[PDB]
C-alpha cells in the first residue's frame, strides 16, 4: 500500500532541492528513476541502513528513515536536468511488494553568453540586461553548479546573480586552471567590483511557444530575417529560447539569425560535418577567437519563435 500524495507531474527549477513524500503500510525500500530508455536505482533501505548509489552520494537520502520506519520520503539535492524522470517508490515486505510513481520535470537551462560588444565587455549591470534580452535572468551559483554536474564545460569567465564571476571546467588545462588547478569544478574569482567586465551566464526557465526555422533559396540578411519571422506571424527567437529548444532535442545543420543579431544553430546528434562532433548550440563568430557577431548583411536562415 505505497502512495505518493502528490499530483503528477511535478515541475521544479534547476538547482533546487526536491522532496518526494512516500508512505506505506524489516521492509525493503527501493527508490529508482526512469529516464528515457534507462533506469537508475537511487537507493535501497532495510533494517535501518540506507545504501546509496555511488554517483548520488550526499545528493539523495531518506531524511525520516529509520526514525519513522513507515516514511520513505526521498530528498534530492542540487536538481539537474538529468534528474528529471519518473521516480518510483518501491517497498517490499517478504514476497509482497507494491510501488508508487511520480514524474518529475526539472525546468531550465544555463548557457554562457558573449555579447555583441564581444568578449569580456559586460559589467554587472549590462550582464543582467543581456540575460533579460535573451529570455532569461542572470544565473545563480546553485544553477551553475547543477549545470556543471550535467556536463557543462565553458572556459569563459562570466558574471553571476551573486556578483561573483565563475566558469565551469571539467577538463583542466592551461588558461582554464583558475583557483582549482587540475581539479575539476566551477572556478571562481570571488565577488568582483561591478565595473569589471566579463561575459555572463544566463538561466532560461521556460518558454510557452515553439522555435522553428524559416528559410529561402537565397537566405536572409538580419533585417530580412526579422521581417520573415514577422510575416509568418512570429518573431526572431532569442538565444535563451534556442537553448531551450535544443534542450528539447531541436537539431538543424544550418546557421540562422537570432533576435540579438547573433548567428547560432542547434545540434542534438553528434556528426562530423554538423557541429564538429559536438552537441549543443553552436555559435558562428567572425574571428577565430570566438569574437564578433557576423555582419548584418551576411545571409543566413531565420530562427523564429511563435
Ligand atoms: C584578478 C586576479 O588576479 N584574479 C585571480 C586569478 O588570475 C586570473 O586567472 C585567470 C584564469 O581563469 O586562469 C586568467 O585568465 C586566463 O588568462 C589567459 C592568459 O591571458 C587567457 O588565455 C585565458 O583565456 C582563455 O584562453 C583559452 C585558450 O586560448 O585556450 C580559451 O579557450 C577556449 O575556450 C572556449 C570555451 O570553452 C572553447 O570553446 C575554445 O575551443 C575552441 O572553440 C572553437 C569554437 O567553438 O569556435 C572550436 O572551433 C570549432 O569547433 C567546432 C567543433 O568541432 C567545429 O564545428 C567548428 O568548425 C566549423 O564546423 C562547422 C560544422 O558545423 O561542423 C563547419 O560547417 C559545416 O561545413 C560542412 C562542410 O562544408 C558543411 O557540410 C556543413 O553544412 C551542411 O552541409 C552543406 C553542404 O555540404 O553543402 C550545406 C548545409 O549548410 C549543411 O547541410 C557546415 N555546417 C553548417 C551548419 O553550415 C565549418 O566549416 C567549420 O568552420 C570549429 N570552428 C572553426 C572556426 O574551426 C575549436 O575547435 C576549439 O578549440 C577554447 N579555445 C582553445 C584555443 O582551446 C578560453 O575561451 C579563454 O577564456 C584566461 N581565462 C579566462 C577564463 O579568462 C587571468 O589571466 C588571471 O589574471 C587566479 O587564477 C585566481 C587563483 O589564484 O585568483 C584570482 O583572484
Ligand atoms: C544531461 O542531459 C543531457 C540532455 O541532452 C545529456 O546530453 C547529458 O549527457 C546529460 N548529462 C549527464 C551527466 O547525465
Ligand atoms: C573599477 O573601478 C576601480 C575603482 O574605481 C578601478 O581601479 C578599476 O580599474 C575598475 N575596473 C575595471 C575592470 O575597469
Ligand atoms: C581576436 O582576434 C582578432 C583578429 O585577429 C583580433 O582583432 C582580436 O584582438 C583578438 N582578441 C580579442 C580579445 O578580440
Author numbering: 30 to 54, 70 to 350
What text comes from the article?
Aggrecan (ACAN) is a large, secreted chondroitin sulfate proteoglycan that includes three globular regions named G1, G2, G3, and is decorated with multiple glycosaminoglycan attachments between its G2 and G3 domains. The N-terminal G1 region interacts with the glycosaminoglycan hyaluronan (HA), which is an essential component of the vertebrate extracellular matrix. ACAN is a large, secreted glycoprotein that spans more than 2500 amino acids in humans. Its N-terminus includes a globular region named G1 that shares ∼39% amino acid identity with HAPLN1 and is composed of an immunoglobulin (Ig) domain and two Link modules. We demonstrate that the single immunoglobulin domain and the two Link modules that comprise the G1 region form a single structural unit, and that HA is clamped inside a groove that spans the length of the tandem Link domains.
